């Protein structure tokens, strides 16, 4: 699971929308599964079929986790400063001297 900036609020519960699994033939849907009408049998013009949708939940930590962010979104134009000598100021001062 991604993260855009470092100090960002993160949803600790991730809602899951899942279809209906017929575990055995003749299974009836649980009495919390709302019907969504997103199932096309043709496309143009739109004719549709309904489907069963089961709510599900996911808290972070057991299988899902945050990802590495990096990628600094702060520009602030770069510029070095304050170099007395690493090894190449002693030798380069004399050239124009």
């Amino acid at each position: 699971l991604q993260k855009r900036w470092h100090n960002e609020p993160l949803p600790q519960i991730l809602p899951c929308v899942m279809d209906w699994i017929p575990g055995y033939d003749g299974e009836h849907a649980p009495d919390d599964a709302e019907i969504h009408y997103d199932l096309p049998v043709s496309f143009q013009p739109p004719r549709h079929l309904p489907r069963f949708v089961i709510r599900r939940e996911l808290v972070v930590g057991e299988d899902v986790q945050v990802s590495r962010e990096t990628g600094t979104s702060v520009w602030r134009p770069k510029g070095t400063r304050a170099d007395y000598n690493n090894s190449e100021y002693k030798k380069v001062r004399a050239e124009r001297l």
Binding site: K91, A94, E95, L97
Partner: protein
């Protein structure tokens, strides 16, 4: 063609403020450099009047010339005097155009031409080196146990005069004997100043190399140079007014660049 003139420099009076002329007078290599970038050229004169360009001595005219730094009192003020003369016209409006702190009063150009014929009593001082090539450059005395290792080296060492006299009748004998060569004579000579003069000259070298061209990458080096000084005067009688003018155009001794020049 005498172009005798003066350059009265600004000695300070506070060794807490920076003093440019006083520091400049302590190094005769830079003294010669300062006196020599004057009358620079007409090659790039029409380009810039502001003396803001990368320096290169090749653009400057390589005419040998002379100067001498001395001290005098006019009537009420000590001020060190620099006397110069050259075959080219004076144009000190560019050598000091951004270093006006080097100067005290604006410089003045005079016109003078000599005439002495023979045997008058109206002559002046002189500056020279006491430089002689050594009779016995003894085999390079080395160090470690105060020993002698080397073979020979012809060096222009200082003049080793006698040990039972003083140099106001030893160097006096020296230039009295030297005078009939250069076309004059000395009836009296008393020295005023003697000693050493020091300087420093930089040597460009080359050790490192560059990966895409020739060896631009390179280091610095300095070397010292020393000379023996003699400032003295005399009431002199010129032998002939036909060969002494060459001596008045070259000077007794030819340090030239390093101070010791002609009779003044």
């Amino acid at each position: 063609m005498i172009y005798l003139s003066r350059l009265l420099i600004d000695t300070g009076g506070n060794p807490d403020r920076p003093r440019p002329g006083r520091k400049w007078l302590d190094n005769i290599y830079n003294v010669h450099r300062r006196l020599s970038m004057a009358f620079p050229s007409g090659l790039r004169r029409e380009q810039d009047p502001h003396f803001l360009k990368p320096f290169s001595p090749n653009d400057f005219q390589k005419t040998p010339f002379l100067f001498r730094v001395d001290n005098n009192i006019d009537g009420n003020d000590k001020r060190a005097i620099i006397i110069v003369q050259s075959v080219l016209e004076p144009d000190w409006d560019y050598c000091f155009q951004n270093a006006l702190d080097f100067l005290a009063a604006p410089p003045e150009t005079k016109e003078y031409n000599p005439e002495f014929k023979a045997g008058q009593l109206l002559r002046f001082r002189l500056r020279v080196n006491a430089s002689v090539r050594r009779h016995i450059p003894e085999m390079v005395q080395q160090d470690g146990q105060t020993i002698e290792t080397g073979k020979i080296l012809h060096k222009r060492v200082s003049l080793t005069w006698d040990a039972s006299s003083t140099p106001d009748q030893a160097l006096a004998d020296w230039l009295a004997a030297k005078s009939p060569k250069l076309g004059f004579t000395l009836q009296r000579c008393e020295l005023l100043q003697l000693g050493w003069v020091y300087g420093s000259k930089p040597e460009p070298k080359n050790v490192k190399v560059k990966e895409q061209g020739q060896g631009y990458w390179r280091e610095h080096k300095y070397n010292p140079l020393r000379f023996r000084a003699a400032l003295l005067e005399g009431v002199l009688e010129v032998d002939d007014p036909k060969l002494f003018l060459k001596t008045l155009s070259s000077g007794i001794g030819k340090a030239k660049s390093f101070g010791f020049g002609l009779l003044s």
